[PDB]
Amino acid sequence: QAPINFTSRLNRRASFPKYGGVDGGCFDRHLIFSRFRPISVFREANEDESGFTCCAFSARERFLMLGTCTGQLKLYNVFSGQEEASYNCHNSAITHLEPSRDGSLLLTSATWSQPL
């Protein structure tokens, strides 16, 4: 077994295959998904209060597609912090929101609006 220490997993992987041997894979992930830090805060300073419901990322991760309580999805740059272009999509709200991988489609679901 690879040892519980990480630097001793670093000396061992130099003279052994990929991770350090048997049981070296998760011992990376028990060090690297156990911490987080805030990057940036995104408001909805239009009515001076934020009313989003659903969120996702684009097919190339450059813009994050929020969804308000009014019925419109609003694009935002992940680097800038500025609205790009809203879209009057539904009437009720937004529950589910995902793109595809090829970058062609978009599925947006409403709460009670007559096309769902």
Partner: protein
């Protein structure tokens, strides 16, 4: 876009899997070692081993096993890559035609799932009914073997047992059956099964075996007489056969883990075992005949057999001879005894094999200030630890110094009839003459004979009739036991000066102008037999000892003034055999005749540094095509001789090369001398059978060792090396070490074997125990293999361990460079350490220590206690750069012998790699990617220019040209991120772009600058890289016009070359992680290019289609120019 060039300098050395059998012949046992991608087909002689054909493939060989199916007199070989493409191999030989046939193949893999945890495991059924494969952790992929399979079909019968540790097959019981070692949630067991291939379903198993030892690692199945399954564990050994059971717990196997096994006897009577520490054991089975037909087990014996290298292959060959195969160093061949020695070892050491194995650091450094830089790679492991020195050319270093520049010829004169004892020499100027002696390395001048004490000589050989041939002005003569009167001075009937004479051991060949004479050496009689005449005057003559150890040569060599002559005569009779007149002003030093173990060639030493490849049959007179090879600007000399044996062949030219062999192949290998004109077979008292070299400089009586491209010299230390640095001012290296020790109950610690760490010239220990306030060092119970590191300063030339500085308890040595900091002119050693404990997370302790070597004494000047582990250090313009737990922390030297943190950085996951070139800093992250970081000297602080975002686990990085940045990966791959040019906005200028992808099928440890060839003052720059299999290659930069020239030649060769496996090279070099199957671009795989030299011209002519050539210009490609461009790359390597 970035286009670069990658070849193989060192072929891989560490071995992986060793299968014996009858692959080549039916009744001939052989050895089949795979190393990384090569498949080395040996054969077993009674004297040892012998290769047949080395074959490389496009994929990492990890699983291999021979098998003879029913229907084949010989066997077959099955090999699976690391990219899941399988193949079935078949050897075909037809005379000298030595071929590998892949009978069936097919990439078998799945879209989804975890691959594995313990690698890939594959075992063949003994009835040759199925083929085992553990591939995706829940599937058990079975290959139904049939001649119906021109491609491989696949089954996937689900394992309801997920986490399998080992799997094997059991022997002949009318059904193909399986064994496990499965980890239950509650306990662990050994289950069996039974597979119906006609029904794809597990049947009801014959064994249950509901609980076993807690650490069962391997399963050793015993054969058909007394069939069962031994279960080795960490601590004990069992036996199982469904009804009975036997169990032992021998006190031998108490301090090591069993790693390898083999079936020694064909009825399975004996078994050999290795360990993790070098031992070899033997399992003896007490065969018990209970009844007239009943075979059963009685006793289990474990006998200690002695110490070898760390085994991962284990093959008993025959007659007590076993090969030991190591990844970790020095795969060697051993012999078993019957009686014992002073330590109980039956193990007889034999000849070894050279392995680099795991390279952990490199530095390309020259020690003789030539254009050729030497290479010092840290190699080995726990007790195989050894620096290895890799150099181009041939190491002519055991040479005497005698001041005779530009001298024409030195020829022996003996007095002992039955030995070479008391050999005086002949000093031959042009117009002057002396007689030389040899006191080993030194000379004495005298006058001995009385014939040639007045006029010059040219050629005075050694007659096997205990005579000698003296040539003074115009006449030849025989020599008695040192006379002063002539024995038989045959005059010449022309009364002219001899233009070019020559001699042999049975004949005299003298050319005067155009008249070519011949003398038959009788006992004390010179008789004329044959005579022929040349159309021009004779430029030179050559006589080589071809046959019978007598001096009879069926061929002749003819050279003419201002006329290239390939005229070939039957020299005893001078019969015309081949007549070819090339023509031209270049004067040749005619022909060197030496058979290079396969064919007689002719080797013409042309004027002004030119070389031709001629091939002649010694009985017909038909020549092949010529081949222009450049050596220099002066006329060349081609000679053959005896170094000690094997008829060594040398090229005395402006580029002095060894012609004879290079991995048994005609590729030139240099020597460590600048320019060589002549050679002289002298007789030194301190140099056995050595030769002196008359040059444009001094005379070097030296011999030549084993000839290869890369001579490898081992400096063993018997402990794990970590890094390597270099001192210019001091003449010393530095190697960080790692030794295994156990904790004593009374004493502090104790070692295990006498390595070169304790055997040092001076010892010391660290002081100022500054981790004393932390109460973390609590007590441990037993001696459970702690690690102890120290600094080893190795001498420059004697390579003696000069000093050892043992660190504190459980303090690693992780980082080492050697540079100068600030305005202090001292050159330091800088070691950044970390404090480690198991059962602990990432550490938050450590210090950084700076050393010096004042008068051969190591001094601890200053230390800096740092809250974090130190991973990488590089010098940065007089300032110290470090990487301390995702915090790039640049330093600064003060006059107060301290350090001051000048700046910091905090946007990192975990920064492990640091490379600088000028004022850019390239940071290799743990999981994310290439990170380029700027340093503004005006601001004083770092600045994030850009950052890549695609999460690849880094392995090693290196700056190419401050625009293109090379990065490796854990997924055995290469890519370059190019800094983005279109700075249109601020978002698009903080994003790097991955430009070019490559699958270097090998782990990468090191990168460094510096080349391996001599500086003759093409391509630009050179980066060498360190690996884990001992496979050093080169990375360099191309020109974009040549990239379009080279890449189209890759696509031409990828329709002609049938690589073994039928593997597409575009598919094999494709960038393949677990989530990206993106095809490769950018780089050039020059190892596919340089095999064009091996392609025959009826298949080279089909490579040359309507292609392009740059010599702003535009020309259709031709065969004789495309073969030049490869040679423009082959001169690098």
């Amino acid at each position: 876009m970035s286009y670069n060039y990658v070849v193989t300098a060192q072929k891989p050395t560490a071995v992986n899997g060793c299968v014996t059998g009858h692959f080549t012949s039916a009744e001939d046992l052989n050895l089949l070692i795979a190393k990384n991608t090569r498949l080395e087909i040996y054969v077993v002689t009674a004297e040892g081993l012998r290769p047949v054909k080395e074959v490389g493939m496009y994929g990492k060989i990890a699983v291999m096993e021979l098998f003879r199916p029913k229907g084949e007199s010989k066997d077959l070989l099955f090999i699976l890559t690391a990219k899941y493409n399988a193949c079935i191999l078949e050897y075909k030989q037809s005379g000298e035609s030595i071929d590998i046939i892949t009978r069936a193949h097919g990439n078998v893999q799945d879209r989804i799932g975890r691959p594995s945890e313990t690698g890939i495991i594959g075992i063949i059924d003994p009835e040759c009914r199925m083929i085992g494969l553990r591939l995706y952790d829940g599937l058990f992929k079975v290959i139904p073997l049939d001649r119906d399979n021109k491609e491989l079909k696949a089954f996937n019968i689900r394992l309801e047992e997920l986490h399998v540790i080992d799997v094997k097959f059991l022997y002949g019981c009318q059904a193909p059956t399986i064994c496990f070692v499965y980890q239950d949630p509650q306990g662990r067991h050994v289950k069996t099964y039974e597979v119906s291939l006609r029904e794809k379903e597990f049947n009801k198993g014959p064994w249950k075996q509901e609980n076993v030892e807690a650490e069962a690692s391997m399963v050793i199945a015993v054969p058909e007489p007394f069939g069962g399954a031994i279960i080795i564990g960490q601590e004990s050994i069992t036996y199982h056969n469904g009804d009975k059971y036997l169990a032992i717990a021998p006190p031998i196997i108490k301090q090591s883990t069993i790693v390898c096994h083999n079936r020694v006897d064909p009825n399975g009577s004996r078994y050999l075992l290795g360990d993790m520490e070098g031992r070899l054991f033997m399992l003896l089975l007490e065969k018990e005949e209970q009844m007239d037909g009943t075979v059963t087990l009685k006793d289990l014996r474990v006998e200690l057999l002695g110490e070898t290298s760390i085994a991962e292959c284990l093959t008993y060959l025959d007659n007590g001879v076993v090969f030991v195969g190591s990844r970790l160093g020095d795969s060697q061949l051993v012999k078993l005894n019957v009686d014992s020695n002073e330590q109980g070892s039956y193990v007889v050491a034999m000849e070894t094999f050279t392995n680099l194995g795991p390279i952990v650091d490199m530095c390309v450094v020259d020690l003789e200030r030539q254009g050729q830089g030497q290479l010092v790679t840290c190699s080995g492991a726990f007790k195989e630890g050894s620096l290895r020195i890799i150099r181009n050319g041939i190491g002519i270093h055991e040479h005497a110094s005698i001041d005779l520049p530009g001298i024409k010829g030195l020829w022996p004169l003996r007095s002992d009839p039955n030995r070479e004892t008391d050999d005086t020499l002949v000093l031959s100027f042009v117009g002057q003459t002396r007689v030389l002696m040899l006191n080993g390395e030194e000379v004495e001048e005298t006058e001995l004979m009385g014939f040639v004490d007045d006029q010059q000589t040219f050629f005075c050989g050694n007659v096997a009739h205990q005579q000698l041939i003296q040539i003074t002005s115009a006449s030849v003569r025989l020599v008695s036991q040192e006379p002063k009167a002539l024995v038989s001075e045959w005059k010449e009937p022309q009364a002219k000066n001899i233009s070019v004479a020559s001699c042999n051991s049975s004949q005299v060949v003298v050319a005067v102008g155009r008249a070519l004479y011949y003398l038959q050496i009788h006992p004390q009689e010179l008789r004329q037999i044959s005579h022929t005449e040349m159309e021009h005057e004779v430029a030179c003559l050559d006589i080589t000892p071809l046959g019978d150890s007598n001096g009879l040569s069926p061929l002749c060599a003819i050279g003419l003034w201002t006329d290239i002559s390939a005229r070939i005569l039957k020299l005893p009779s001078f019969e015309l055999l081949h007549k070819e007149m090339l023509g031209g002003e270049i004067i040749p030093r005619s022909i060197l005749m030496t058979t290079f173990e396969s064919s007689h060639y002719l080797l013409c030493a042309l004027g002004d540094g030119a070389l031709f490849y001629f091939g002649l049959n010694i009985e017909t007179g038909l020549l092949s095509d010529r081949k222009k090879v450049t050596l220099g600007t002066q006329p060349t000399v081609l000679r053959t001789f005896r170094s000690l044996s094997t008829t060594n062949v040398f090229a005395c030219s402006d580029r002095p090369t060894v012609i004879y062999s290079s991995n048994h192949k005609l590729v030139f290998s240099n020597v460590n001398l600048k320019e060589v004109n002549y050679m002289c077979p002298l007789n030194s008292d301190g140099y056995p059978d050595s030769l002196a070299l008359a040059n444009n400089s001094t005379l070097t009586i030296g011999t030549i060792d084993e000839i290869q491209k890369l001579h490898i010299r081992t400096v063993p230390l018997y402990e794990s090396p970590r890094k390597i640095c270099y001192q210019e001012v001091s003449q010393c290296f530095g190697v960080l070490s790692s030794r295994i020790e156990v904790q004593d109950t009374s004493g502090g610690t104790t070692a295990l074997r006498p390595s070169a760490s304790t055997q040092a010239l001076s010892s010391s220990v660290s002081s100022s125990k500054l981790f004393s306030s932390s109460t973390a060092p609590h007590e441990t119970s037993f001696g459970e293999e702690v690690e102890v590191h120290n600094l080893l300063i190795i001498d420059q030339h004697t390579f003696e361990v000069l000093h050892a500085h043992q660190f504190l308890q459980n303090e690693y040595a992780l980082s080492l460079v050697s540079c100068k900091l600030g305005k202090d002119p001292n050159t330091y050693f800088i070691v950044g350490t970390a404090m480690v404990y198991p059962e602990e997370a990432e550490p938050k302790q450590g210090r950084i220590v700076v050393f010096q070597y004042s008068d051969g004494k190591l001094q601890t000047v200053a230390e800096k206690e740092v809250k974090g582990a130190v991973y990488s250090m590089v010098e940065f313009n007089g300032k110290l750069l470090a990487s301390i737990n995702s915090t790039v922390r640049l330093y600064e030297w003060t006059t107060e012998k301290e350090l001051r943190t000048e700046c910091n950085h905090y946007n990192n996951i975990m920064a492990l790699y640091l490379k600088t070139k000028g004022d850019f800093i390239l940071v290799g992250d743990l999981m994310r990617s290439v990170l380029l970081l700027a340093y503004k000297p005006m601001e004083g602080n770092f600045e994030e220019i850009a950052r890549d975002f695609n999460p690849n686990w880094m392995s090693a990085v290196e700056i190419l040209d401050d625009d293109n940045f090379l990065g490796a990966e854990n997924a055995f791959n290469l890519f370059v991120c190019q800094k983005d040019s279109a700075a249109t906005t601020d978002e698009e200028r903080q994003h790097l772009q991955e430009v070019g992808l490559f699958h270097l099928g090998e782990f990468v440890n090191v990168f460094c600058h510096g080349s391996l060839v001599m500086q003759n003052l093409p391509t630009q720059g050179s980066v060498l890289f360190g690996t884990v299999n001992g496979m050093i290659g080169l990375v360099t930069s191309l020109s974009e016009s040549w990239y379009n020239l080279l890449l189209d030649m890759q696509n031409r060769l990828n329709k002609v070359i049938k690589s073994v496996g039928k593997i597409e090279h575009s598919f094999w070099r494709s960038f393949h992680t677990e989530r990206k199957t993106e095809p490769a671009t950018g780089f050039i795989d020059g190892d596919l290019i340089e095999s064009f030299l091996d392609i025959s011209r009826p298949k080279m002519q089909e490579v040359v289609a309507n292609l392009q050539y740059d010599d702003g210009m535009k020309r259709e490609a031709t065969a004789d120019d495309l073969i030049k461009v490869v040679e423009e790359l082959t001169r690098i390597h």
